[PDB]
């Protein structure tokens, strides 16, 4: 069934599973026309498909050309997401295909289910968790590759860099979601925290800085503090 706090450790067992987040598939700017009416301009987006156990990210870039001449784009974006995830499963060898796909938004269930009809043993599941994967475009290297794309394109990343050499998936996922939660609640502060110290660099093949273990502890504390402060501000607590 649905995924929640109770059955959270299932993410880190050895059953292959993927999260799919469609929040950044259809992205627009809103602007005024000469005659004063409002219009949208699409920019490039991406499907965020992540194996939480291994860090493997399948970033499917959605080029604005997909939308040309189409109506009801927000609805279409859900079916294009499902189309692309299904194609991704088909492209993987059998022993790499997931046993479950967890969609971060319930509106994706019917489209994926319909697109996955060829895979009746792949379970499509919703989640009750409030996952922060929308903030994926706050990771500079991911936003950069999406905005530069001139055609549809799949880019692979490990979203955990090399963390699993030293920590477990559980902890890696907790760090990732903390980082993203912070970037989501106050991107400017979050990014300030990550880069304040110019002597800690990001490897060419990484997304995040090469913090030592001790420095990751200071970072994670700084992100937690940021998140709590923003809460009191939002609600006056």
């Amino acid at each position: 069934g649905a995924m929640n706090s109770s059955n959270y450790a299932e993410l880190f067992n050895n059953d292959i599973k993927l999260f799919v987040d469609d929040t950044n598939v259809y992205r627009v700017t809103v602007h005024k026309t000469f005659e004063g009416n409002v219009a949208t301009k699409a920019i490039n987006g991406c499907i965020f498909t992540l194996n939480p156990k291994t860090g493997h990210l399948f970033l499917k870039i959605i080029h604005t050309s997909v939308w040309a001449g189409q109506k009801r784009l927000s609805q279409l974006a859900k079916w294009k997401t499902a189309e692309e995830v299904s194609a991704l499963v088909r492209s993987l060898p059998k022993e790499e295909q997931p046993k479950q796909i967890i969609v971060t938004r319930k509106a994706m269930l019917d489209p994926l289910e319909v697109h996955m009809l060829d895979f009746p043993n792949i379970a499509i599941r919703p989640t009750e968790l409030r996952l922060p994967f929308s903030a994926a475009m706050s990771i500079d290297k991911l936003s950069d590759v999406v905005m530069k794309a001139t055609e549809p394109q799949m880019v692979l990343f490990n979203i955990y860099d090399d963390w699993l050499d030293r920590i477990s998936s559980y902890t890696a996922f907790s760090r990732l979601t903390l980082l993203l939660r912070a970037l989501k609640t106050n991107e400017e502060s979050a990014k300030m925290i990550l880069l304040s110290d110019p002597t800690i660099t990001i490897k060419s093949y990484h997304l995040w800085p090469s913090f030592t273990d001790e420095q990751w502890i200071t970072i994670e504390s700084q992100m937690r503090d940021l998140i709590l402060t923003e809460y009191g501000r939002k609600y006056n607590v």
Binding site: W79, A82, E83, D110, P111, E113, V114, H115, L117, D118
Partner: protein, 300 residues
């Protein structure tokens, strides 16, 4: 006009014939129903005074033979049977009339209700949903499950309704995933109408039979099947105009006939609100929409 005699009435039971019904007391001298209109299917149904669970009954057509009811004290229920001795049968019917121990099918001449509820129902199709080919009549009851229900246990006792499933390969052409799921026209017209049912009239007949089974026996899988077949039409953008107009009449008389107190379990809120107000055919069911609003505005 035809007759269905009863051997006796040993147990207190409410007897129904089509939309009419009568209370019969234990060992009351009751011996049949006469003046049954030839030309339509009919259903005789029962509910014992002691077990207000398990409504059950028999679908039949008097053209197909001479049928009668007899209580079986081993199995504990009124059984329909066929008399092959045509003479022996007219003998029993005439003497029970002479002794006036039979109720008359109480049809008002102005009233086309039963015609309207059974317009497309044909005994031959009923016998393919209720497979029991040694009898010419068909038993149905409250608890019988459908073939689709069984897939998600005893097949001899199944309702073999046509399986409809909106999230199946049948329903969805590869490459037209989004199209076919938002616009079921393909599934309705090519797969179901041209492919399985062959014509609109067989489709309507199963739809009507599923409704009558849900209404008369509270058969839950039948209710599911009636709603699915309505939803398949209302969720298709391209439907023959003759089907839409006829559907509006069919549903009207079904909603009209339903017991007011049963609207809660028999009427699926989601399906009706989607059909009447959200679907492609929202504007094609004026009579069904008008009676639903005036009689069950709560459900909507």
């Amino acid at each position: 006009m035809n007759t269905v005699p009863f051997t006796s009435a040993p147990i207190e039971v409410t007897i129904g014939i089509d939309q009419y019904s009568f209370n019969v007391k234990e060992n009351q001298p009751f011996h049949g129903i006469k003046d049954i209109p030839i030309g339509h299917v009919h259903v005789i149904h029962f509910q014992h005074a002691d077990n207000s669970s398990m409504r059950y009954g028999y679908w039949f057509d008097c053209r197909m033979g001479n049928f009668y009811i007899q209580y079986d004290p081993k199995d504990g229920l009124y059984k329909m049977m066929e008399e092959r001795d045509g003479a022996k049968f007219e003998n029993i019917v005439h003497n029970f009339k002479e002794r006036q121990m039979m109720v008359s099918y109480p049809k008002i001449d102005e009233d086309d209700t039963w015609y309207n509820l059974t317009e497309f129902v044909q005994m031959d199709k009923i016998r393919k949903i209720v497979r029991k080919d040694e009898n010419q009549f068909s038993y149905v009851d409250s608890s019988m499950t459908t073939v689709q229900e069984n897939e998600l246990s005893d097949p001899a006792h199944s309702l073999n309704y046509t399986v409809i499933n909106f999230k199946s390969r049948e329903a969805i052409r590869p490459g037209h995933e989004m199209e076919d799921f938002l616009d079921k026209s393909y599934y309705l017209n090519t797969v179901m109408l041209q492919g399985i049912f062959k014509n609109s009239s067989n489709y309507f007949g199963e739809l009507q039979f599923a409704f009558l089974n849900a209404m008369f026996f509270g058969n839950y899988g039948s209710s599911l099947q009636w709603h699915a077949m309505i939803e398949l039409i209302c969720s298709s953008a391209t439907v023959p105009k003759h089907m839409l107009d006829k559907l509006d009449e069919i549903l009207y008389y079904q909603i009209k006939t339903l017991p007011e107190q049963y609207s809660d379990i028999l009427l699926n809120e989601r399906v009706w609100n989607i059909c009447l107000y959200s679907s492609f055919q929202k504007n094609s069911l004026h009579n069904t929409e008008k009676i639903m609003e005036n009689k069950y505005p709560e459900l909507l």
